[PDB]
Amino acid sequence: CPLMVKVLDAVRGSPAINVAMHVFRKAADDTWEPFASGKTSESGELHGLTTEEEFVEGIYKVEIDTKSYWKALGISPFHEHAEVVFTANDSGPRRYTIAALLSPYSYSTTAVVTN
Amino acid sequence: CPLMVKVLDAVRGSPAINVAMHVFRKAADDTWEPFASGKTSESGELHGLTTEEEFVEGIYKVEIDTKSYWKALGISPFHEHAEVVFTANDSGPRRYTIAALLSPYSYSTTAVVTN
Amino acid sequence: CPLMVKVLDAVRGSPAINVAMHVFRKAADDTWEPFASGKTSESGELHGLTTEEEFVEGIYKVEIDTKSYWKALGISPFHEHAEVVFTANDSGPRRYTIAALLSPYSYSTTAVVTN
Amino acid sequence: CPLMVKVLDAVRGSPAINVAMHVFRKAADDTWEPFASGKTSESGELHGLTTEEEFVEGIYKVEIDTKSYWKALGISPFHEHAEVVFTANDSGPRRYTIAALLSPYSYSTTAVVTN
Numbered sequence: 209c210p211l212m213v214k215v216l217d218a219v220r221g222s223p224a225i226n227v228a229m230h231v232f233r234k235a236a237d238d239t240w241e242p243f244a245s246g247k248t249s250e251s252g253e254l255h256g257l258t259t260e261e262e263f264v265e266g267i268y269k270v271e272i273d274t275k276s277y278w279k280a281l282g283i284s285p286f287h288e289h290a291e292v293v294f295t296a297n298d299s300g301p302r303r304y305t306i307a308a309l310l311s312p313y314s315y316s317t318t319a320v321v322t323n
Numbered sequence: 324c325p326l327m328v329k330v331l332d333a334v335r336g337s338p339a340i341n342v343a344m345h346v347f348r349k350a351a352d353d354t355w356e357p358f359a360s361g362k363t364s365e366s367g368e369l370h371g372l373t374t375e376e377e378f379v380e381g382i383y384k385v386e387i388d389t390k391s392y393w394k395a396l397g398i399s400p401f402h403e404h405a406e407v408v409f410t411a412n413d414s415g416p417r418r419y420t421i422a423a424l425l426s427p428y429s430y431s432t433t434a435v436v437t438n
Numbered sequence: 439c440p441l442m443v444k445v446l447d448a449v450r451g452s453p454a455i456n457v458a459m460h461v462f463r464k465a466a467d468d469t470w471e472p473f474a475s476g477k478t479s480e481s482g483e484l485h486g487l488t489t490e491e492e493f494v495e496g497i498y499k500v501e502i503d504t505k506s507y508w509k510a511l512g513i514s515p516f517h518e519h520a521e522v523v524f525t526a527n528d529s530g531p532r533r534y535t536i537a538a539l540l541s542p543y544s545y546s547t548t549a550v551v552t553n
Numbered sequence: 554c555p556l557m558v559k560v561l562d563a564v565r566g567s568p569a570i571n572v573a574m575h576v577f578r579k580a581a582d583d584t585w586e587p588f589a590s591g592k593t594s595e596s597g598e599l600h601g602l603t604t605e606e607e608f609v610e611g612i613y614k615v616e617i618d619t620k621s622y623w624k625a626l627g628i629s630p631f632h633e634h635a636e637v638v639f640t641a642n643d644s645g646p647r648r649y650t651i652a653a654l655l656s657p658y659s660y661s662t663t664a665v666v667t668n
């Protein structure tokens with residue numbers, strides 16, 4: 209599991225459950241090609257997006273559908289989605305955890321890169 | 324100033340100066356059209372991006388070029404840029420301040436929306 | 439204004455108005471002596487807490503009463519308050535802006551230090 | 554394990570390892586009584602601070618020694634420590650995770666409260 213995404217809800221102090229997200233890889237034409245997708249579990253985590261062999265160096269975008277999450281809770285959010293755009297690099301550590309902390313008008317995202 | 328962006332550097336405890344950013348607006352064909360661009364001042368603020376007349380309702384993307392900022396400082400960061408995507412002026416004209424707080428492996432973005 | 443505090447509300451996307459805060463300075467006996475206090479304005483800012491002459495070197499604690507803020511709004515938050523503790527003016531006089539971004543279960547605080 | 558603390562480093566994009574912290578419980582005299590302490594592991598987590606029977610309702614303070622963490626890395630931080638002050642409440646979910654995201658001039662803290 210080279211890539212895992214964890215989403216937290218700062219209003220309720222909980223994992224953000226059933227949050228959909230799509231991962232894209234930047235192609236040579238500079239368009240975003242679909243790569244992987246899924247929805248967070250009861251723990252707010254999405255595991256199994258990709259494999260080591262598949263996740264090669266390149267630029268990736270994780271598009272988290274935060275608007276649908278907030279609307280399902282009856283809250284009107286600011287952002288259309290949360291976007292995390294980054295280069296995967298073999299010179300560094302092996303495993304990427306992308307964390308996203310969600311509020312209606314704010315979000316933060318953090319990368320924890322380990323071996 | 325219907326749209327203003329302020330950027331802070333969490334490593335130095337300072338405004339983030341000379342941060343470039345590009346604003347796009349979603350066209351009717353669902354492509355991102357260039358809207359405005361600029362760089363932050365010594366206060367870390369970018370004013371004057373647009374006018375009330377030109378900033379119509381739509382979906383806007385503010386791409387803050389954080390990697391270029393960190394690389395100019397000799398730091399290799401995680402993200403390519405920060406991408407703030409939002410619907411603007413759907414209730415009528417509003418004033419938007421987008422704040423961004425930058426660290427090499429993490430950032431947060433917040434919107435202050437006033438009438 | 440050697441010390442200023444700005445507070446934002448990540449749920450409403452607005453300045454956090456009427457947030458009370460109490461500033462303390464560590465005395466020679468290692469107890470927290472009351473230093474200054476105030477509340478944020480409609481802009482979410484608190485100015486005029488102290489003067490250059492009175493804000494000497496020391497360890498300061500800014501206690502932002504976030505629970506009182508959220509409870510006045512009918513939200514039960516996690517934290518009692520946010521506590522920002524720092525050494526000030528150890529290199530000579532500086533200007534400090536303490537920013538705080540509030541959600542019910544999360545907050546961040548950042549310092550901008552200028553000479 | 555009713556209480557767990559996780560600390561992340563936003564400069565290196567890593568768990569913050571060997572971060573010391575002390576937990577205090579507010580006594581009836583309104584003084585902070587030592588409760589538990591430890592240091593984060595290689596995963597940035599501190600487990601086993603307390604037990605269900607011991608962690609009764611009341612106000613607790615987690616004081617994370619962030620200054621020593623940054624100084625050990627050769628970086629001059631703003632804050633003396635990070636402070637998380639909160640009420641433990643039996644009316645809510647059973648397990649508390651306190652997360653802290655550290656930068657030299659900024660930190661965020663989040664509570665994830667689950668069953």
Ligand SMILES: O=C1c2ccccc2C(=O)c2c(O)c(O)cc(O)c21
Pocket residue numbers: 214216305307308309316317318320559561650651652653654661662663665
């Ligand atoms: O709460 C957070 C959290 C809060 C604000 C920013 C980042 C994180 C974060 O990265 C994070 C993790 O990586 C994690 O593994 C468990 C967490 O609870 C968090």
